[PDB]
Design a protein around this ligand. Structure first.
Ligand code: HEC
Ligand code: HEM
Ligand code: HEM
Ligand code: HEM
Lengths: 55, 104, 79, 31, 239, 378, 55, 51, 55, 51
């Protein structure tokens, strides 16, 4: 029974590894895309003097 | 006023305010039917069980047509009988005994 | 759960009439309108008061909000 | 078994034609 | 202080089965061409949409051909000007929002295609905005580029009073009073916001008649089917 | 034997719809389940025809909606039916929940939980669908509701940005919301099938709150026409809304293209969320407000456990009846205040209303139930 | 002999004939109701609708 | 098909022929009306006006 | 079907919507498939009733 | 809840406490592994590939 349970456990370990890889890939696909990510911190504002009010 | 019978008066007021009089229903006909009430109904004598079925069916028929039993035929607070109370108390007591045995 | 076996009822006899034999609107004025009126009377004093309180609160809140934004005579009078 | 007579339904029945020449089949057809 | 609530005017089309006055729509469109079109855009209205409401197809074509528009690249990959067709939308006064802001003292003139539906009070507001241009109250000051308008939320609008008596000559010949001009403009803007107004009213009348026919009939059918239960009598006969 | 009893599909249809034993005394309040099903079918069809012309891009969504209403033949009626049909869907949903609460229908615990899941799915579907137009209201309401998830203590910002698909609401968020809005109603239909499956185990309840096995009735020749009449009345109300007051329940701010820079002075969600909105404004803490909203929606799960009365229905419980109508008036107060801005009277009345909403269905209702039990000497 | 009885004996007895009568009535009712509703709406807005202006 | 080759099946077909004709007419008129088929609706009086 | 005089953006959007909806219809139709299969049960390669060796 | 107040239920809880602890550990380690928390995955001797 220990040998059989060892076979089952190794199979479950492999299945869990594959499942996590797939789920993480899909979830990351739902995350921010490369083009959106690029135009995030690179842009730097160059602001002039807009009188004495909030702009 | 508060001299004891005031409680009876407010109970009578609540009983009249509750509308199951208008449908010719006894208070024990209005009880929610859970497992204990189901077994208490099963333990009722056949005549009481039949009387209950008609009273409820008549109430359902009146409610379907949105009508009301005549004022004379309304169930009276003084006249009301609690036929299911003994059986329900017995079933609840037996269940509590079983639970107390289980927890021991 | 079919209609055959649901409950045990004994000697309860019911009489019904064909839909075509009878009229679709019986007792419209003799019973129907008084029945609707008595139903409304029964439910009125248990439903309406809550909404009357709601309407009072609504009116008072709207008027108070109006008053809050039309004020401050003394705030500029001291000037 | 013998005391079971249908209660009066006349207050719900349609205003059937009183001509008395209209056969029951004809009145049923009209309704 | 919160902006003044516009007073509900008795618009002709405000009725349940009323329709837009298409003469008023034509006059309002004319005023849009003459006055509004200089700075306000209508990106969602073409020179069609007018074949069925006010102008005929030939008249709409003649109207559209008046203004030339940029066309797609020809040979050599060069964009050229074209006389202008029905499917072309109304001309855009400014190439982009930045040009509009530069030409209007930093303020962007909103698109008028939805302006009636985009403002609380609808056309009723717009009329008031074009109507009330009182001088600033005692104790308020504003920049040169702004004009006091009580119905504007900030009371300081960047639009100079756009219409006045005899600013344009109506083709019909009605007196070009500023009030008449404003009413016609608001009617046209309402039409632009709701081109389906007349069709919606017609379908509403038809469905009202349909429901008036059906609801009593379906209720009678339900009563007929349920009469057996509604009138059935039951008796209890214990032995 | 008739064909109904032979073909398995006919077996299911006859057992569940044609020949389903239902109480005869069922009132008009039970007509809103069929109305909700009709609302779902109408929303699915109308949204399909709308999406046939809708482009889910931040740069073209507003123009696509304008093209639908102006160019697509009979496009205005379809869009109006979808908008006012969502409004009618939430009206019918609120009335269905009110009936379930009033007539002790929450005692069908599994059915009640499936209904709670259905309500959550419908709320999410309507939220994303309202985001779809990409108007000013759509953009700013989407930003507010999505930023609501930043209250999460540890994974707050990461979750919000993951939902956004970026650092702020933009085109990827709009496309995400369009796809979710497309998928969700079919999940809602499946959840409704589970709803009906769990309901059929016990059967429908009746206003009296007393077993009706004596007076069961077939559904085909009675409740079919009763529901048809209900559907006719619902369609009449919907056509009045779409043909005479198309913008009665709408905010005249989704007709301005969404600019992420300027925010409209009065940003409010759609009316059926206003009560929830008030809850957020009631609690001074951000996480407190989010939790209060979650409890405001999820307290329906705790309602069955708080049923301390010996009678299922409230028609024989005048005190609980008055408490229920007080709760309904409180909900109306919450909605009205959610419509109104933040100021001196509105904020305090909204806080009082939120406290009353939480206390009535958590304290006052069980105490009144126990008092009634004592008053009936059992 | 009432008109309803004659109609029942002639058309309503057989349900297929009932459906045929229903469909023919649908055609004629659609035509007549559409014409009447259009006439009513046009009369209410005689001076506003474009149709008159076009002439 | 062989079992149906009998006199009483012919009698049944004769009995149900009027029903089949009525249902065919129902279907045909419904198809003409639903599609507003101009080719056929150009002959029926009082409908020709609607074109 | 085209939504115009030739395959274009109208056709693509219609196809996208149909492509989105149709697989769920396929899933429901597959549930009906399994429901109708359930009445008789699965078949075996031999082509003989396997009530003796059900599992 | 009142019915559960008894010595037998206390014995049952004592019996099932190891199972509850083991399942809680299963859930916690599974969450850490799935999310790659790295707050906790830094302490573990191996699994220090998150440089
Ligand atoms: C440049 C000259 C100018 C012309 C002429 C003009 N507008 Fe405007 N309009 C503006 C500007 C600039 C604004 C926005 C000002 C601001 O937001 O501070 C504006 C705003 C508006 C508003 C209100 C928008 C709001 O946010 O309340 C309406 C309505 C409008 N325009 C329509 C019209 C109509 C009707 C006319 C009648 C011919 C007209 N415009 C003519 C420049 C003009
Ligand atoms: C899309 C959403 C929903 C659909 C399609 C739906 C459908 C239905 C239908 C058709 C019924 C049949 C009985 C009736 O019509 O009253 C029903 C019953 C019921 N529903 Fe729903 N429902 C929905 C949402 C909800 C919600 C939000 C709740 C509770 C919060 C709920 C709880 C119940 C309960 C308790 C019943 C039992 C009825 C009874 O006791 O007779 N449902 N539902
Ligand atoms: C659960 C049922 C549904 C509800 C409650 C719902 C709700 C809404 C709401 C409130 C809007 C915004 C309407 C507006 O302000 O203009 C909307 C828009 C939209 N919905 Fe749905 N919807 C439902 C089902 C569907 C389905 C099944 C589709 C399938 C494609 C769909 C597609 C759309 C599209 C494309 C829009 C954008 C066009 C528009 O704004 O009218 N909806 N929906
Ligand atoms: C999306 C497409 C389909 C799905 C999901 C599906 C699903 C299934 C499943 C799960 C079974 C159970 C038995 C097995 O797996 O062999 C089955 C059986 C069956 N399917 Fe389908 N199927 C599909 C398409 C088809 C097609 C295209 C046909 C015929 C042209 C078909 C005819 C059958 C038949 C005759 C059986 C009976 C098997 C037996 O008797 O053992 N199915 N189907």
């Amino acid at each position: 029974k220990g040998f059989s349970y060892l076979v089952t456990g190794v199979t479950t370990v492999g299945v869990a590894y594959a499942a996590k890889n797939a789920v993480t890939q899909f979830v990351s696909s739902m995350s921010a895309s490369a083009d959106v990510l690029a135009l995030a911190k690179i842009e730097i504002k160059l602001s002039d003097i807009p009188e004495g009010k909030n702009m | 006023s508060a001299s004891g019978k005031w409680l009876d008066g407010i109970r009578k007021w609540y009983y009249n305010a509750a509308g199951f009089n208008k449908l010719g229903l006894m208070r024990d006909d209005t009880i929610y039917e859970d497992e204990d009430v189901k077994e208490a109904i099963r333990r009722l004598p056949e005549n009481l069980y039949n009387d209950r079925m008609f009273r409820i069916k008549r109430a359902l028929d009146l409610n379907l047509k949105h009508q009301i039993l005549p004022k004379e035929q309304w169930t009276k607070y003084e006249e009301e009988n609690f036929y299911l109370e003994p059986y329900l108390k017995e079933v609840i007591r037996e269940r509590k005994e079983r639970e107390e045995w289980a927890k021991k | 759960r079919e209609f055959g076996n649901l409950t045990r009822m004994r000697h309860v006899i019911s009489y019904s009439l064909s839909p075509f034999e009878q009229r679709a609107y019986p007792h419209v004025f003799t019973k129907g309108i008084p029945n609707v009126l008595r139903r409304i009377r029964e439910s009125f004093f248990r439903v309406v008061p809550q909404f009357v309180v709601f309407y009072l609160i609504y009116t008072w809140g709207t008027e108070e909000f109006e008053r809050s934004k039309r004020k401050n005579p003394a705030a500029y009078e001291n000037d | 078994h013998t005391d079971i007579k249908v209660p009066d339904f006349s207050e719900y029945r349609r205003l059937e034609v009183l001509d008395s020449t209209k056969s029951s089949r004809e009145s049923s057809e009209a309704r | 202080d919160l902006e003044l609530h516009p007073p509900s005017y008795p618009w002709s089309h405000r009725g349940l089965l009323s329709s837009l006055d298409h003469t008023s729509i034509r006059r309002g469109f004319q005023v849009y061409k003459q006055v509004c079109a200089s700075c306000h855009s209508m990106d969602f209205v073409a020179y069609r949409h007018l074949v069925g409401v006010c102008y005929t197809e030939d008249e709409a074509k003649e109207l559209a051909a008046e203004v030339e528009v940029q066309d797609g690249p020809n040979e050599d990959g060069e964009m050229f000007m074209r006389p202008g067709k029905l499917f072309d939308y109304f001309p855009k006064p400014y190439p982009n929002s930045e040009a509009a802001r530069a030409a209007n003292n930093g303020a962007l003139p909103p698109d008028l295609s939805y302006i009636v539906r985009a403002r609380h009070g609808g056309e009723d507001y717009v009329f008031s905005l074009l109507t009330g241009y009182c001088e600033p109250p005692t104790g308020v000051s504003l920049r040169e580029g702004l004009y006091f308008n009580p119905y504007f939320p900030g009371q300081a609008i960047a639009m100079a009073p756009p219409i006045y008596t005899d600013v344009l000559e109506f083709d019909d010949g009605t007196p070009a009073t500023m009030s008449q001009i404003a009413k016609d403009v608001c009617t046209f803007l309402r039409w632009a916001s709701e081109p389906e107004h007349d069709h919606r009213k017609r379908m509403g009348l038809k469905m009202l008649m349909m429901m008036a026919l059906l609801v009593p009939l379906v209720y009678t059918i339900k009563r007929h089917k349920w009469s057996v239960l509604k009138s059935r009598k039951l008796a209890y006969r214990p032995p | 034997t008739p064909m109904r009893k032979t073909n398995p599909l006919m077996k299911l249809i006859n057992h569940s719809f044609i020949d389903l034993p239902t109480p005869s005394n069922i009132s008009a309040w039970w007509n809103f389940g069929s109305l909700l099903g009709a609302c779902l079918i109408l929303q699915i069809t109308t949204g399909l025809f709308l999406a046939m012309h809708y482009s889910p891009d931040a740069s073209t969504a507003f123009s696509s909606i304008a093209h639908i209403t102006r160019d697509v033949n009979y496009g205005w009626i379809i869009r109006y039916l979808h908008a006012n049909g969502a409004s009618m869907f939430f009206i019918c949903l609120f009335l269905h929940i009110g009936r379930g609460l009033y007539y002790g229908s929450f005692l069908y615990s599994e059915t009640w939980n499936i209904g709670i899941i259905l309500l959550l799915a419908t709320m999410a579907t309507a939220f994303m669908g309202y985001v779809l137009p990409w108007g000013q209201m759509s953009f700013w309401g989407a930003t507010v509701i999505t930023n609501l998830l930043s209250a999460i203590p540890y994974i707050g910002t990461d979750l919000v940005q993951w939902i956004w698909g970026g650092y702020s609401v933009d085109s990827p968020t709009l496309t995400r919301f369009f796809t979710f809005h497309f998928i969700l109603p079919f999940i809602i239909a499946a959840l409704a099938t589970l709803h009906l499956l769990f309901l059929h185990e016990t059967g429908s309840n009746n206003p009296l709150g007393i077993t009706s096995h004596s007076d069961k009735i077939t559904f085909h020749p009675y409740y079919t026409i009763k529901d048809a009449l209900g559907l006719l009345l619902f369609l009449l109300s919907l056509m009045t809304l779409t043909l005479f007051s198309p913008d009665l329940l709408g905010d005249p701010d989704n007709y301005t293209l969404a600019n992420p820079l300027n925010t409209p002075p009065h940003i409010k969600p759609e009316w059926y969320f206003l009560f929830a909105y008030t809850i957020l404004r009631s609690v001074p803490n951000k996480l407190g407000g989010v939790l209060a909203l979650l409890l405001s929606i999820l307290i329906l799960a705790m309602i069955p456990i708080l049923h301390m009365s010996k009678q299922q229905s409230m028609m024989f419980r005048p005190l609980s009846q008055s408490l229920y109508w007080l709760l309904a008036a409180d909900l109306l107060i919450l909605t009205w205040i959610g419509g109104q801005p933040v100021s001196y009277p509105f904020t305090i009345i909204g806080q009082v209303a939120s406290v009353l909403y939480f206390t009535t269905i958590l304290i006052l209702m069980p105490t009144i139930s126990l008092i009634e039990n004592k008053m009936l000497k059992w | 002999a009432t008109l309803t009885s004659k109609l029942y004996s002639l058309l309503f007895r057989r349900t297929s004939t009932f459906a045929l009568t229903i469909i023919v009535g649908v055609m004629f009712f659609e035509r007549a109701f559409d014409q009447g509703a259009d006439a009513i709406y046009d009369h209410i807005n005689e001076g506003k609708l474009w149709k008159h202006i076009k002439h | 098909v062989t079992r149906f080759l009998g006199p009483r099946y012919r009698e049944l077909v004769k009995n149900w022929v009027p029903t089949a004709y009525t249902w065919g007419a129902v279907g045909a008129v419904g198809l003409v009306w639903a599609t507003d088929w101009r080719l056929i609706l150009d002959w029926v009086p009082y409908i020709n006006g609607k074109f």
